[PDB]
Design a protein around this nucleic acid. Structure first.
Lengths: 411, 192, 184, 101
RNA sequence: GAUGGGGAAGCUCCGUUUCAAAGGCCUGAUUUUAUGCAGGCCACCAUCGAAAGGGAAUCCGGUUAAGAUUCCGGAACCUGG
């Protein structure tokens, strides 16, 4: 054949530039990135940059051609055009002045569903659990955020309902294995069929919403995660023989509005799932009953909330500066006891967490070479130097920790 | 889809929540209302504040009836509003820092026995002794307003929301006009 | 420099109409109901929007459903059809007539104001045929007329007619002179 | 009953059949950043300023650990939104490169 | 020689840039009254037309009933990935 141009085969056509991909798809960057997020597509870096970018050295972003081509056949692309046309026609009606026509048009529209995206993105059920970490984190973050002009109240309510349903399922099955508390918030590491899924849970305190962040991407992520978690919860409930959706007692919702509100019914295998068995724990006003109650319920018996209509218990959780009465019938234990008990899994002694007593630190559950180096090659020499530097920097983790411990031990 | 029942007003100090209505459209805030709402620090739309249903406040509530709505929120709604929204207007000077630090409650009050946000919630829900002190410290929550958008779908939603006001909010303007009481729980579930 | 041919053609048409002398029968428009009275007329006419296809369909289905299980007067509405408007005109049945000033074929509407004044029927020129269309469930009608009206709006209609007569009909009766398009 | 159907069912398909489908790269577990960690981990006052002077993306420790004596004293976190936003951006914008450690 | 046009009743003639909306490159956190797209640059514009024009690259030896820079042995050189 005739001469073949350099930038026409190989990496040149194997990867398509983002700008070229947008032009080929004839879709706005917003919709294109929405589809990419829904399909879970990511950019890729070839071993040679100039070769892929038509021989031009630029900070171009590359995407796999096959994935983009497959994306073009997704019905979501047509649904986006349908939504755009509906919005244009509704603006036309609003400008005309026939509100009734706009209402009739709205009553006919139907929203697209990501059911077929989940099937291909997660061919098997365990795959969804293996990556539901990000979905759980996002849902737990959004459930606590306040509604604003960007995020609607309904979205936050749905996220909170999903989080509550997940917590209720976890508590009913007692799948909690390890827990942790940090500045970022409390961490929960359940075991859903052996996936050891971890999910952060921030404290139930107000959070500032800076304008720097863009919730538009977060809105789409939460929209996808809503369907993902709904399907996962339905599958889990069907596997466990529990009815779905789980109804909630409005009487409890008015009082506590949380874990106990959802009364899940049909129609124990690990020491962590047996701690505090047949025990009843009292919780004070200062402790985060929302976090503490779930842990105790998943581990052992029920909990008596500090809330009332505004005893046969054996332990009481309180974090007041000074104990109030200390009735002989209630054991007083600091909230740190529950976390340490879960981490140890063997009911750590309660005599180390009495009220006012100092709490123990919390720990997360997770010579001739000088001459011989002459014969080493340049690349090998550089690699050995990098390895030595990496060893030295890691040694600092122990050196500066032991030095600071020695300094602290003075008093 | 709505029910009404005439009930005699009692004298007990029931818990009430006030939400700014921002109306009527053509009425300019009169001096009487200007002072009444200024004393209640409800000087901005969507502002929320907790008050005590004392007999000395019933005439003021009746007078400001067109300007605001009232109801009896539940403990869960009060707790959610307090723990999700809050204001602390003090040295930090006019900084609007929010209740992210329980130690601040200890510092400001200290002796009143209010050491955490849950203590404030319980005091408000049970008409505690520190109700007056904590409420002033608990500057009004800036509740998010309605859809707050001007667009294709947003305007249609706003029209439907407005049409419900005539079926839910009305005033007779007579001295005998009973105070309209609505479930604040539903409104909060809609606003929040 | 070059622009689209149609854009240039329409710009040339505009700058020619702005500069071409026209007989008084033309340019009888461009002296139109003011923004205030125009808005008042729209408000009055906004209460008599003709029943759209969906509204009529739902009403008929509801009536049929009640009938299947086993009196009101004629609904007053605006009249907009050019043939129907010109038929209400010349018969004295028309009370208020609105004329669009931006009709593409000028000849279709040149004689309408003259006939309306000859018959002694109140008439008003309002900018924008789309505005008439927006209130008639159509793209445009180029004309709008009123018929028997509810007693509540009778006073409003009379006041609007008096205002139109005071503002446009009497003030712009001089439009016969001053051949339009004389701007330098 | 919208969404109330098991789209997975009995299945054993593997999405990794194509090597281009790289792993989700779950975040690493937390290490010694507890609300009540050993006081030796506390950063010194000058080191706090030095760390604060560092630019973004070079902030492995995104906060200064503090020895909170009581659970109630634990304050809220305002950077939780920022961390999740950064993670979401990295998920669908950070170039994924296959490598062997 | 179409292309956008004009003349010709018409088979058709003119015209090659002719006053055509005549395509080809890149960037962005997702574009703020909230997930319908914004911005940066150039202004030419198909095709055919040469086996004596320019060109990417094979030399030798041997072999047939007719074929050799092609068939066989050896050793060569160009393009793309």
């Amino acid at each position: 054949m005739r001469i073949k141009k350099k930038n026409t085969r190989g990496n040149a056509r194997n990867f398509i530039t983002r700008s070229q991909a947008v032009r080929k798809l004839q879709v706005s960057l917003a919709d294109f990135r929405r589809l990419c997020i829904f399909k879970g597509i990511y950019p890729r870096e070839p071993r040679n940059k100039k070769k892929a970018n038509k021989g031009s050295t630029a900070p171009t972003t590359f995407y796999y051609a096959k994935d983009i081509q497959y994306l073009m056949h997704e019905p979501v692309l047509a649904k986006f055009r349908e939504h755009k046309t509906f919005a244009r026609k509704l603006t036309r009606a609003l400008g005309r002045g026939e509100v009734s026509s706009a209402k009739r048009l709205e009553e006919n529209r139907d929203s697209y569903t990501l059911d077929h995206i989940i099937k291909e993105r997660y061919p098997s059920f365990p795959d969804a659990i293996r990556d539901i970490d990000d979905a759980l984190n996002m849902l737990f973050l959004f459930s606590n955020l306040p509604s604003t002009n960007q995020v609607s109240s309904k979205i936050i309510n749905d996220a909170q309902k999903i989080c509550n349903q997940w917590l209720a399922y976890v508590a009913k099955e007692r799948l909690v294995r390890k827990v942790f508390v940090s500045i970022k918030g409390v961490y929960y590491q359940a075991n859903i069929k052996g996936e050891e899924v971890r999910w952060l849970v921030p404290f139930k305190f107000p959070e500032n919403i800076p304008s720097d962040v863009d919730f538009r991407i977060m809105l789409t992520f939460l929209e996808f995660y809503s369907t993902l978690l709904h399907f996962v919860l339905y599958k889990l409930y069907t596997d466990s023989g529990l009815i779905y959706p789980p109804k909630l007692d409005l009487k409890k919702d008015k009082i506590i509005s949380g874990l106990s509100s959802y009364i899940l019914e049909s129609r124990y295998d690990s020491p962590v799932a047996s701690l505090f068995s047949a025990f009843v724990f009292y919780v004070s006003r200062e402790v985060p009953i929302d976090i503490l109650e779930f842990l105790i319920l998943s581990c052992g018996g029920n909990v008596i909330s500090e809330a009332a209509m505004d005893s046969k218990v054996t332990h009481q959780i309180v974090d007041r500066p000074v104990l109030k009465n200390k009735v002989a019938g209630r054991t007083y234990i600091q909230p740190q006891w529950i976390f340490d008990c879960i981490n140890k899994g063997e009911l750590v002694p309660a005599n180390k967490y009495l009220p006012g007593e100092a709490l123990p630190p919390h720990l997360s559950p997770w010579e001739e070479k000088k001459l011989k180096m002459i014969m080493m090659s340049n690349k090998q020499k550089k690699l050995y130097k990098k390895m030595k530097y990496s060893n030295a920097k890691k040694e600092e983790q122990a050196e500066n920790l032991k030095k600071k411990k020695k300094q602290i031990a003075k008093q | 889809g709505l029910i009404r029942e005439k009930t005699t007003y009692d004298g007990k100090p029931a818990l009430l929540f006030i939400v700014r209505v921002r109306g009527p459209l053509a009425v300019n805030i009169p001096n009487k209302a200007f002072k009444i709402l200024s004393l209640l620090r409800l000087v901005e739309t969507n502002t929320g504040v907790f008050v005590k249903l004392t007999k000395n406040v019933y005439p003021l509530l009746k007078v400001i009836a067109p300007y605001v709505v009232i109801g009896k929120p539940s403990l869960s709604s009060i707790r959610s509003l307090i723990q999700k929204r809050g204001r602390i207007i003090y040295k930090g000077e006019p900084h609007e820092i929010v209740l992210n630090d329980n130690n601040i409650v200890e510092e400001q009050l200290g002796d009143h026995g209010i050491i955490c946000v849950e203590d404030i919630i319980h005091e408000i829900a049970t008409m505690g002794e520190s109700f007056s002190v904590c409420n002033f410290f608990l500057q009004p929550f800036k509740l998010n307003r309605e859809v707050s958008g001007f667009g294709s779908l947003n305007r249609l939603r706003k029209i439907k929301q407005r049409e419900a006001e005539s079926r839910t909010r009305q005033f007779s303007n007579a001295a005998t006009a009973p105070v309209i009481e609505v479930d604040i729980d539903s409104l909060l579930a809609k606003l929040n | 420099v070059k622009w689209p041919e149609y854009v240039r053609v329409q710009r040339q048409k505009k700058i020619l109409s702005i500069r071409l002398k026209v007989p008084p029968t033309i340019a009888q428009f461009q002296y139109t109901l003011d923004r205030n009275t125009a808005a008042e007329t729209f408000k009055l006419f906004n209460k008599y929007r003709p029943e759209t296809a969906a509204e009529k369909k739902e009403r008929l289905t509801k009536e049929a459903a009640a009938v299947a299980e086993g009196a009101s007067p004629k609904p007053y509405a605006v009249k907009y059809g050019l043939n129907h408007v010109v038929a209400l005109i010349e018969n004295k049945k028309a009370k208020l007539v609105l004329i669009a000033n931006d009709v593409d074929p000028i000849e279709l509407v040149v004689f309408l104001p003259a006939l309306c004044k000859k018959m002694g029927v109140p008439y008003a020129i309002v900018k924008g045929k789309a505005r008439l269309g927006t209130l008639v469930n159509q793209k445009t009608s180029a004309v709008a007329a009123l018929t028997e009206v509810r007693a509540e709006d009778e006073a409003a209609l009379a006041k609007l007619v008096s205002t139109i007569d005071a503002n446009f009909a009497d003030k712009y009766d001089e439009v016969k002179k001053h051949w339009g398009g004389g701007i330098l | 009953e919208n969404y109330q159907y098991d789209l997975w069912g009995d299945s054993t398909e593997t999405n990794d059949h194509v090597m281009h489908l790289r792993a989700p790269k779950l975040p690493p577990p937390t290490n010694e950043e507890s609300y009540n960690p050993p006081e030796e981990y506390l950063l010194s006052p000058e080191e706090k300023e030095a760390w604060e002077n560092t630019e973004y993306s070079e902030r492995e420790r995104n906060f200064i650990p503090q020895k909170y004596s009581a659970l109630r004293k634990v304050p809220g976190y305002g950077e939780s939104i920022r961390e999740r936003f950064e993670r979401s951006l990295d998920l669908y914008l950070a170039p994924r490169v296959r490598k062997n450690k």
